[model samples]
Target: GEDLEQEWKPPDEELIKKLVDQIEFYFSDENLEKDAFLLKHVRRNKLGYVSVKLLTSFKKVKHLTRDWRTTAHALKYSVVLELNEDHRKVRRTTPVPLFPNENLPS
Candidate 1:
């Protein structure tokens, strides 16, 4: 016997099709807030990602992607988190009194 490993040949045709179908499905009749209600459950990664968790689901079929999207095509299962310049955002702020009573270092 000899130690041998074949190249795990990726992306022939099906993966491309799957990726296209996935995108189409999402944009067409399956909205994240409407048709596919579970889309709301799909959350974002604080580290930067649009993530979907499954207790019973693509699961085995979802491919790999660690993204850095600014332009053209992305990988099949990759997520691209878009950063915005709007002021409307998360305020992880604490309350402070309009006037500090004694300790101004509040």
Candidate 2:
């Protein structure tokens, strides 16, 4: 027997929220510092932009939608993410924090 593909979920408000949050976390100050895989990839290109294709392959988000345009459209509402002119790539509106996980009151 072979492993079957998971059921697909159409894009909607709920799915958009999930997708945006997932990408936000990847570039978030708290996560970017520790997530070496993402940091390396984000740094590979100018302005930290990465392709939507790369995001669609993520295990946690792949099932959300198979279409890259769907993913790009969903990110429109994200204040933290900015999509490139063609909507093929995205990057944080703000730069990654130099000191992550350090803004706490003692």
Candidate 3:
């Protein structure tokens, strides 16, 4: 094993919690109803899976990329999200619902 002067602890519970928050928030009903960015990606795959790389792009979770495999493995415990067979992508356990709409005052 290569020794490095700087050592960031490997991703674990805290990282998994943060990653779950990011994933859930991105796919949450409140956000999905308004986020065109997430909508496009969710639509890219019929099953609604978004790439793992996309999840790691968040500033809060960028550091998790160094051990994304471990991070993804940890996500298996999430109740709301699930990973693809290859564990390279994740999606909500529930299907995306129709966009919410509200009439504006005239």
Q: Where is the poorest 10-residue window by lDDT in model 1? A: 87-96
Candidate 2 steric clashes: 0
Which stretches of model 3 miss by more than 4 angstroms?
Answer: 1-10, 63-67, 100-106
Can you give the TM-score per candidate against the true fold? Answer: 0.29, 0.72, 0.69
- Each prediction's total of clashing residue pairs, residues at least 3 apart in sequence or on different chains, is 0, 0, 0
The C-alpha stretches of model 1 lying farther than 4 A from their native spots are 1-7, 27-30, 35-38, 46-106
lDDT of 3 by residue, 12-84 (tens): 7777777777777787778767776777677567778987776777555676554556557656867888898
What local lDDT score does residue 100 receive in model 1, on the 0 to 100 scale?
A: 21
Candidate 3, clashing residue pairs? none
Ranked candidates (TM-score, high to low): 2, 3, 1
Residue by residue across 1-68, what tens digits does model 1's lDDT show?
Answer: 79787333344454445543443344232343353333322322232222222211233224532212
How high is the lDDT of residue 19 in model 3? 70
Q: Is candidate 2 or candidate 3 better by lDDT?
A: 2
Q: Give the Å shift of residue 90 in candidate 1.
A: 22
Candidate scoring better on TM-score of 2 and 3:
2
Better of 1 and 2 by TM-score: 2
